[PDB]
Write an enzyme that holds these catalytic residues in place. Structure first.
Site, PDB file in Angstrom:
ATOM      1  N   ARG C  13     -37.899  -2.177  -2.472  1.00 29.80           N
ATOM      2  CA  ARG C  13     -37.541  -0.853  -1.968  1.00 29.80           C
ATOM      3  C   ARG C  13     -38.512   0.200  -2.520  1.00 29.80           C
ATOM      4  O   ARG C  13     -39.726   0.045  -2.407  1.00 29.80           O
ATOM      5  CB  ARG C  13     -36.052  -0.642  -2.225  1.00 29.80           C
ATOM      6  CG  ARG C  13     -35.152  -1.509  -1.343  1.00 29.80           C
ATOM      7  CD  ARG C  13     -33.735  -1.641  -1.844  1.00 29.80           C
ATOM      8  NE  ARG C  13     -33.083  -0.333  -1.924  1.00 29.80           N
ATOM      9  CZ  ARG C  13     -32.544   0.340  -0.911  1.00 29.80           C
ATOM     10  NH1 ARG C  13     -32.495  -0.177   0.312  1.00 29.80           N
ATOM     11  NH2 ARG C  13     -32.056   1.556  -1.126  1.00 29.80           N
ATOM     12  N   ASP C 143     -33.049  13.229  -7.699  1.00 30.77           N
ATOM     13  CA  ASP C 143     -32.205  13.188  -6.515  1.00 30.77           C
ATOM     14  C   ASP C 143     -32.084  14.603  -5.965  1.00 30.77           C
ATOM     15  O   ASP C 143     -31.596  15.490  -6.656  1.00 30.77           O
ATOM     16  CB  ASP C 143     -30.865  12.589  -6.907  1.00 30.77           C
ATOM     17  CG  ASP C 143     -29.850  12.467  -5.788  1.00 30.77           C
ATOM     18  OD1 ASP C 143     -30.012  13.156  -4.723  1.00 30.77           O
ATOM     19  OD2 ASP C 143     -28.936  11.685  -5.987  1.00 30.77           O
ATOM     20  N   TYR C 156     -22.732   8.751 -11.531  1.00 35.90           N
ATOM     21  CA  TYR C 156     -24.085   8.699 -11.000  1.00 35.90           C
ATOM     22  C   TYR C 156     -24.725  10.089 -11.054  1.00 35.90           C
ATOM     23  O   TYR C 156     -25.880  10.259 -11.468  1.00 35.90           O
ATOM     24  CB  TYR C 156     -24.090   8.182  -9.549  1.00 35.90           C
ATOM     25  CG  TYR C 156     -25.401   8.421  -8.851  1.00 35.90           C
ATOM     26  CD1 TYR C 156     -26.505   7.629  -9.119  1.00 35.90           C
ATOM     27  CD2 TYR C 156     -25.564   9.476  -7.974  1.00 35.90           C
ATOM     28  CE1 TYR C 156     -27.739   7.875  -8.525  1.00 35.90           C
ATOM     29  CE2 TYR C 156     -26.788   9.747  -7.384  1.00 35.90           C
ATOM     30  CZ  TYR C 156     -27.879   8.948  -7.669  1.00 35.90           C
ATOM     31  OH  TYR C 156     -29.079   9.219  -7.101  1.00 35.90           O
TER      32      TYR C 156
HETATM   33  N1  LIG Z   1     -32.640   5.370  -1.583  1.00 34.44           N
HETATM   34  C1  LIG Z   1     -32.349   6.667  -1.491  1.00 34.44           C
HETATM   35  O1  LIG Z   1     -31.983   7.189  -0.451  1.00 34.44           O
HETATM   36  C2  LIG Z   1     -32.484   7.522  -2.722  1.00 34.44           C
HETATM   37  C3  LIG Z   1     -31.930   8.800  -2.685  1.00 34.44           C
HETATM   38  C4  LIG Z   1     -31.998   9.621  -3.805  1.00 34.44           C
HETATM   39  C5  LIG Z   1     -32.619   9.166  -4.931  1.00 34.44           C
HETATM   40  N2  LIG Z   1     -33.157   7.922  -4.956  1.00 34.44           N
HETATM   41  C6  LIG Z   1     -33.704   7.449  -6.267  1.00 34.44           C
HETATM   42  O2  LIG Z   1     -34.933   6.802  -6.065  1.00 34.44           O
HETATM   43  C7  LIG Z   1     -34.986   5.613  -6.897  1.00 34.44           C
HETATM   44  C8  LIG Z   1     -35.232   4.371  -6.089  1.00 34.44           C
HETATM   45  O3  LIG Z   1     -34.195   4.252  -5.088  1.00 34.44           O
HETATM   46  P1  LIG Z   1     -33.850   2.815  -4.474  1.00 34.44           P
HETATM   47  O4  LIG Z   1     -32.851   2.996  -3.364  1.00 34.44           O
HETATM   48  O5  LIG Z   1     -35.110   2.072  -4.233  1.00 34.44           O
HETATM   49  O6  LIG Z   1     -33.085   2.080  -5.660  1.00 34.44           O
HETATM   50  P2  LIG Z   1     -32.098   0.818  -5.717  1.00 34.44           P
HETATM   51  O7  LIG Z   1     -32.690  -0.078  -4.701  1.00 34.44           O
HETATM   52  O8  LIG Z   1     -30.709   1.269  -5.551  1.00 34.44           O
HETATM   53  O9  LIG Z   1     -32.320   0.414  -7.208  1.00 34.44           O
HETATM   54  C9  LIG Z   1     -33.653   0.112  -7.686  1.00 34.44           C
HETATM   55  C10 LIG Z   1     -33.558  -0.981  -8.729  1.00 34.44           C
HETATM   56  O10 LIG Z   1     -32.883  -0.527  -9.932  1.00 34.44           O
HETATM   57  C11 LIG Z   1     -32.655  -1.713 -10.671  1.00 34.44           C
HETATM   58  N3  LIG Z   1     -31.518  -1.565 -11.572  1.00 34.44           N
HETATM   59  C12 LIG Z   1     -30.196  -1.382 -11.266  1.00 34.44           C
HETATM   60  N4  LIG Z   1     -29.379  -1.599 -12.273  1.00 34.44           N
HETATM   61  C13 LIG Z   1     -30.225  -1.944 -13.311  1.00 34.44           C
HETATM   62  C14 LIG Z   1     -29.989  -2.327 -14.642  1.00 34.44           C
HETATM   63  N5  LIG Z   1     -28.782  -2.432 -15.177  1.00 34.44           N
HETATM   64  N6  LIG Z   1     -31.056  -2.639 -15.409  1.00 34.44           N
HETATM   65  C15 LIG Z   1     -32.272  -2.573 -14.865  1.00 34.44           C
HETATM   66  N7  LIG Z   1     -32.616  -2.231 -13.622  1.00 34.44           N
HETATM   67  C16 LIG Z   1     -31.545  -1.924 -12.894  1.00 34.44           C
HETATM   68  C17 LIG Z   1     -32.459  -2.866  -9.671  1.00 34.44           C
HETATM   69  O11 LIG Z   1     -33.375  -3.930 -10.014  1.00 34.44           O
HETATM   70  P3  LIG Z   1     -33.129  -5.529  -9.668  1.00 34.44           P
HETATM   71  O12 LIG Z   1     -33.202  -5.586  -8.162  1.00 34.44           O
HETATM   72  O13 LIG Z   1     -34.322  -6.182 -10.318  1.00 34.44           O
HETATM   73  O14 LIG Z   1     -31.823  -6.020 -10.235  1.00 34.44           O
HETATM   74  C18 LIG Z   1     -32.774  -2.227  -8.318  1.00 34.44           C
HETATM   75  O15 LIG Z   1     -33.601  -3.102  -7.562  1.00 34.44           O
HETATM   76  C19 LIG Z   1     -33.697   5.583  -7.708  1.00 34.44           C
HETATM   77  O16 LIG Z   1     -33.893   6.194  -8.988  1.00 34.44           O
HETATM   78  C20 LIG Z   1     -32.743   6.427  -6.881  1.00 34.44           C
HETATM   79  O17 LIG Z   1     -31.703   7.002  -7.678  1.00 34.44           O
HETATM   80  C21 LIG Z   1     -33.103   7.106  -3.890  1.00 34.44           C
HETATM   81  C1  LIG Z   2     -21.834  11.210   0.325  1.00 32.80           C
HETATM   82  C2  LIG Z   2     -23.310  11.217   0.675  1.00 32.80           C
HETATM   83  O1  LIG Z   2     -23.998  10.199   0.725  1.00 32.80           O
HETATM   84  N1  LIG Z   2     -23.805  12.429   0.934  1.00 32.80           N
HETATM   85  C3  LIG Z   2     -25.220  12.734   1.146  1.00 32.80           C
HETATM   86  C4  LIG Z   2     -25.590  11.898   2.371  1.00 32.80           C
HETATM   87  C5  LIG Z   2     -26.128  12.800   3.393  1.00 32.80           C
HETATM   88  C6  LIG Z   2     -26.554  13.571   4.171  1.00 32.80           C
HETATM   89  C7  LIG Z   2     -25.868  12.593  -0.244  1.00 32.80           C
HETATM   90  O2  LIG Z   2     -25.274  13.106  -1.217  1.00 32.80           O
HETATM   91  N2  LIG Z   2     -26.981  11.851  -0.444  1.00 32.80           N
HETATM   92  C8  LIG Z   2     -27.200  11.323  -1.797  1.00 32.80           C
HETATM   93  C9  LIG Z   2     -27.194   9.801  -1.752  1.00 32.80           C
HETATM   94  C10 LIG Z   2     -28.231   9.262  -0.766  1.00 32.80           C
HETATM   95  C11 LIG Z   2     -28.176   7.759  -0.785  1.00 32.80           C
HETATM   96  O3  LIG Z   2     -28.747   7.338  -2.038  1.00 32.80           O
HETATM   97  C12 LIG Z   2     -29.045   6.034  -2.218  1.00 32.80           C
HETATM   98  C13 LIG Z   2     -29.087   5.165  -1.155  1.00 32.80           C
HETATM   99  C14 LIG Z   2     -29.422   3.826  -1.381  1.00 32.80           C
HETATM  100  C15 LIG Z   2     -29.667   3.362  -2.630  1.00 32.80           C
HETATM  101  C16 LIG Z   2     -29.664   4.245  -3.736  1.00 32.80           C
HETATM  102  N3  LIG Z   2     -29.950   3.709  -4.972  1.00 32.80           N
HETATM  103  C17 LIG Z   2     -29.951   4.553  -6.033  1.00 32.80           C
HETATM  104  N4  LIG Z   2     -30.213   4.003  -7.227  1.00 32.80           N
HETATM  105  N5  LIG Z   2     -29.706   5.895  -5.968  1.00 32.80           N
HETATM  106  C18 LIG Z   2     -29.396   6.410  -4.774  1.00 32.80           C
HETATM  107  N6  LIG Z   2     -29.160   7.724  -4.744  1.00 32.80           N
HETATM  108  C19 LIG Z   2     -29.364   5.597  -3.556  1.00 32.80           C
HETATM  109  C20 LIG Z   2     -27.988   9.866   0.611  1.00 32.80           C
HETATM  110  C21 LIG Z   2     -27.992  11.383   0.522  1.00 32.80           C
END
Ligand SMILES: NC(=O)c1ccc[n+]([C@@H]2O[C@H](COP(=O)([O-])OP(=O)(O)OC[C@H]3O[C@@H](n4cnc5c(N)ncnc54)[C@H](OP(=O)(O)O)[C@@H]3O)[C@@H](O)[C@H]2O)c1
Ligand SMILES: *CC(=O)N[C@H](CC#C)C(=O)N1CCC(COc2cccc3nc(N)nc(N)c23)CC1
Ligand SMILES: NC(=O)c1ccc[n+]([C@@H]2O[C@H](COP(=O)([O-])OP(=O)(O)OC[C@H]3O[C@@H](n4cnc5c(N)ncnc54)[C@H](OP(=O)(O)O)[C@@H]3O)[C@@H](O)[C@H]2O)c1
Ligand SMILES: NC(=O)c1ccc[n+]([C@@H]2O[C@H](COP(=O)([O-])OP(=O)(O)OC[C@H]3O[C@@H](n4cnc5c(N)ncnc54)[C@H](OP(=O)(O)O)[C@@H]3O)[C@@H](O)[C@H]2O)c1
Ligand SMILES: NC(=O)c1ccc[n+]([C@@H]2O[C@H](COP(=O)([O-])OP(=O)(O)OC[C@H]3O[C@@H](n4cnc5c(N)ncnc54)[C@H](OP(=O)(O)O)[C@@H]3O)[C@@H](O)[C@H]2O)c1
Ligand SMILES: *CC(=O)N[C@H](CC#C)C(=O)N1CCC(COc2cccc3nc(N)nc(N)c23)CC1
Ligand SMILES: *CC(=O)N[C@H](CC#C)C(=O)N1CCC(COc2cccc3nc(N)nc(N)c23)CC1
Ligand SMILES: *CC(=O)N[C@H](CC#C)C(=O)N1CCC(COc2cccc3nc(N)nc(N)c23)CC1
Lengths: 249, 250, 250, 251
Positions: C13, C143, C156
């Site tokens: 991802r 975020d 979170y």
């Molecule tokens: N996706 C979105 O829409 C979104 C939105 C807002 C912010 N973000 C931020 O952007 C970043 C990447 O997002 P993403 O959706 O790619 O993340 P994700 O797929 O939800 O998580 C990324 C990786 O974090 C690792 N992780 C989880 N628990 C762990 C633990 N206990 N120890 C070590 N590693 C751990 C996992 O590794 P393994 O697979 O190796 O277990 C997972 O593959 C995150 O910081 C997320 O909060 C994403």
């Molecule tokens: C309730 C909700 O999702 N509300 C909005 C969505 C819209 C519009 C919002 O608060 N957002 C925050 C969360 C986003 C989704 O995120 C993630 C999605 C997938 C994986 C993931 N992994 C990790 N570690 N962190 C996050 N935040 C996410 C959508 C927008």
């Protein structure tokens, strides 16, 4: 076909560096100026020597007035007239001086400070959008808007209004694929009139390197925001301040 | 001897509730109005019936112009003329309407009204208030939704953002004089009179706390707090009174 | 001669796209993973096939515990062991799931995972990165929606708010060492694998710019900017990459 | 029948002033304390002398641990056991000390204390408070006006206070359907550390625009009283700075 950009207040300092870097990236540029005709033309000559017929100048006062809307429309029109398109608008031109609350007329200070920093950007934004690819607007904001300089209330109001415009316009123009972002300097190029002792006082407050940002460092953030590397970015304001805004009293 | 307050746009709605609550708290009030002469005079009559010589009206257009500085000076002067003092300024008057970026007031007029009422007039009133100077304070009516703006309201929004700037700048600059400067930021309060019930209910139902708009009195309560002795160390602060609306995602 | 970067949670991802783009820019990379061993090794193989000896994997649980400091030290140590240097840290790994305030992981475990991955592990990695020290920088994955939080995601959200604090605190404290500390804040990027298509589309259509989620590559582009020489004066900054989502009212 | 409030870290300083002002407003109070038993009991005795059976004490460490959830449940339970209700929670208790990034508590202990007291314990108390309701209910978190202009080498403390902002907002949203409001009060310079010399105190006091002095504990308490009152019934998710303009002052 090469994209084209308008940069307001582009004859000197930060606006000049922005124009130069956009030109180096392959843009044709409108160099807007108010009083700095000689420096504007000198810059256009340098850029046109590099690539022929890629830079023009455009004169306008951006003080608020009954004619400001027409002047702003004409700035945008100047880009379409010279280059057949207008891809980027950089709102850089800005009046900057103190307006103490307790003791130019104040109505003139309002017109200049709020006109240059907020109203003219709004009107240019309107005209830019009306006349419509990677389209975007970059507003030169101020990292210190929430820790303002004593006696700069109207200037500060103007920069706060510009934040509002950045956000409002990002939302409203997103359906047209126009992105709207900002770049927010802390201490960059110090006023020409400021003494060296005072310059050093402000430089030494900056955590990262105890120096002001170069104009080129500000320009770098502008280049990023107009690039394909920022195609999902809108409504964002990037601080380029070396950590200054994080420093307590 | 009773303190005195100026409330702009005080003839109706939120400004009226603020003037009434300040009056109930013991202030003498200047009820500023623009077009709402009948409602302003009627309110001053009601307040003076409660306690003699405690309310006057003051008419002024707060659209931006070259004479706005003089108009704002005269508002403050009107408080000193009626009551011999001016302790509190509440910047409440506000023009509010859309100004779309893409397509019969001219844009010159839209700028003058939206930026004038929401930002420049507050600035000039602040200047005049400070020049003429105890618990002295200014309260600006801000907007909890300034960073999640309504589509096509860019000039209004610019005005409210500028007012945040003023709130903060003026707090800093007037602190040495003992003048506090704060804001109250509604979310959904009194809906426009012309809005249909179906649209009103759409906006009401977005509010987490109670799915209803704030009463004018609830807004006024926050103003009363900020001008009180209970807020004597508070300056530069903007209190949201929005029932959680600003925290709700799309 | 080539700089080196640690990317946490880099097997899939967004973290994967960050690792790939850093590698394409000329970095040697440590691919940290927790459970995704097969995907981590596969990515290291792909990168080393492009340029030999430029990728290793590093396994660690980043849940909070009394051993987390040692685990984070060992991640940084793994970069020095493989590449002799550590120029960039990207704090990407993140646990993400609801923790309702009002009602089979214990709450102790939810705290440890959500606050550990999103805040404490970044802090400890930052400490270890700094201790072991050019264009040095840290990028935290933040975020954009931290102030418009998802219902029932309080822990979170607390974690991501703490990460903002760290970004700013560490920028200030490490600036004298020439280490910059910045963040990238997605809105809607890659949607959860477990989410239904109907829900995915609901969130996509909330995004003003293009009514779609950010690709992992678009997030990575902002990271590449912040670690580059084009961001040498930038520290303490968090760049939203959210297509305007955070500006949309309820 | 009188409403009841829990105030954490209420034996001394700001928490004490909060407990006193809530009591003066008509609340029955649980005075939570960790080490300050003599001061906690002394306060309870003073309040009960004013009105009988209106104050109890409750001892707990709010460091993060396997038992913290149970400790926080028991704090809320102690309010219900004493007074039959729990209307207000004030999260005041806080550890505060530097944790430099670059160099005899272990760092895992510093994490547990600074993040536990400032963020996790507030979360767990909030959960327990909400679970037991399941009338003017509200929570007030003691935040920090300077969270975005942090003190050098206080990164874990600052992370904790940032987390608390998140909680304030998240909890406001999630508990609004239950009629529970969640707000914060954010001091700048209030009561200075007991150890600090007058020269250093004056250095910080002179940075404050409004009056060049720190806030009294009572001034902080005044903002808490406002937020729990009927005058704030539409206010939730709000953090009121009580900082004399300090957060607006540039470097
Ligand atoms: N996706 C979105 O829409 C979104 C939105 C807002 C912010 N973000 C931020 O952007 C970043 C990447 O997002 P993403 O959706 O790619 O993340 P994700 O797929 O939800 O998580 C990324 C990786 O974090 C690792 N992780 C989880 N628990 C762990 C633990 N206990 N120890 C070590 N590693 C751990 C996992 O590794 P393994 O697979 O190796 O277990 C997972 O593959 C995150 O910081 C997320 O909060 C994403
Ligand atoms: C309730 C909700 O999702 N509300 C909005 C969505 C819209 C519009 C919002 O608060 N957002 C925050 C969360 C986003 C989704 O995120 C993630 C999605 C997938 C994986 C993931 N992994 C990790 N570690 N962190 C996050 N935040 C996410 C959508 C927008
Ligand atoms: N320098 C800093 O440290 C700093 C800090 C924070 C933010 N910024 C922002 O960054 C941007 C660039 O800063 P800068 O220092 O390079 O700016 P500047 O030198 O103060 O101003 C740039 C140009 O603005 C033009 N301008 C001023 N009044 C005008 C008017 N009435 N009509 C039209 N144009 C007018 C002038 O053009 P002519 O010379 O042609 O008359 C001037 O050269 C500004 O928006 C500024 O607010 C800068
Ligand atoms: N209502 C809400 O939901 C809401 C939401 C967010 C913020 N607020 C803020 O709260 C405040 C009060 O809101 P409101 O709904 O009560 O306001 P409003 O009814 O829309 O307007 C208040 C008064 O402003 C005066 N005004 C308008 N244009 C003027 C001008 N050119 N010169 C002088 N005065 C002028 C009018 O006075 P006359 O009638 O005398 O002409 C009007 O009655 C405003 O600052 C508003 O922005 C309200
Ligand atoms: N003072 C200021 O200038 C200032 C500035 C900004 C924000 N604030 C915030 O305002 C609030 C009150 O400040 P303050 O100076 O009055 O606080 P403080 O005196 O530093 O601490 C208050 C109480 O917290 C308790 N506490 C500490 N560690 C604990 C633990 N492990 N478990 C349980 N309780 C623990 C202690 O209780 P015992 O004594 O019983 O052990 C202590 O008396 C705090 O949240 C603080 O962060 C204060
Ligand atoms: C009071 C002050 O000078 N310094 C504080 C920050 C600190 C410490 C401040 O408010 N700053 C914001 C403005 C910076 C300087 O700026 C400019 C300097 C030179 C020209 C110029 N032109 C224009 N148009 N706008 C601005 N802002 C500036 C210094 C830090
Ligand atoms: C598009 C829109 O209304 N969006 C939300 C609504 C929700 C939920 C929003 O942005 N809000 C901001 C504006 C609020 C309404 O306001 C006013 C209503 C009536 C009169 C009035 N007069 C003046 N002077 N200013 C304002 N702001 C208002 C609703 C929430
Ligand atoms: C480095 C520094 O202190 N900088 C400013 C001071 C100024 C101006 C600052 O960041 N501030 C934040 C911290 C304040 C002091 O605080 C406390 C003082 C005494 C006890 C105490 N206990 C607890 N639990 N938390 C805090 N924050 C404090 C000074 C302003």
């Amino acid at each position: 076909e090469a994209p084209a950009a308008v940069v307001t207040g582009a004859a000197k300092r930060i606006g000049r560096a922005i124009a130069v870097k956009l030109h180096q990236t392959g843009y044709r540029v409108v160099i807007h100026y108010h009083n700095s005709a000689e420096a504007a033309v000198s810059l256009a000559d340098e850029l046109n020597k590099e690539r022929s017929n890629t830079a023009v100048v455009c004169q306008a006062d951006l003080t608020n007035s009954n004619v400001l809307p027409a002047s702003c429309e004409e700035i945008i029109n100047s880009c379409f007239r010279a280059f057949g398109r207008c891809d980027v608008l950089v709102n850089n031109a800005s009046a900057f001086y103190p307006t103490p609350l307790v003791q130019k007329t104040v109505e003139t200070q309002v017109a200049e400070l709020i006109g240059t920093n907020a109203i003219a950007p709004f009107l240019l934004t309107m005209s830019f959008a009306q006349r419509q690819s990677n389209l975007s607007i970059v507003n030169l904001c101020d990292a210190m808007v929430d820790q303002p300089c004593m006696a700069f209330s109207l200037y500060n109001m103007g920069k706060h209004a510009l934040v509002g415009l950045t956000q409002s316009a990002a939302l409203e123009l997103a359906p047209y694929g126009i992105r709207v972002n900002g770049v927010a300097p802390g201490v960059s190029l110090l006023p020409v009139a400021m003494g060296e002792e005072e310059k050093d006082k402000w430089r030494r407050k900056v955590p990262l390197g105890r120096r002001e940002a170069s104009a080129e460092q500000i320009a770098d953030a502008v280049i990023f925001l107009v690039s394909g590397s920022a195609q999902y970015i809108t409504g964002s304001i990037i601080k380029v301040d070396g950590g200054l805004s994080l420093v307590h009293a």
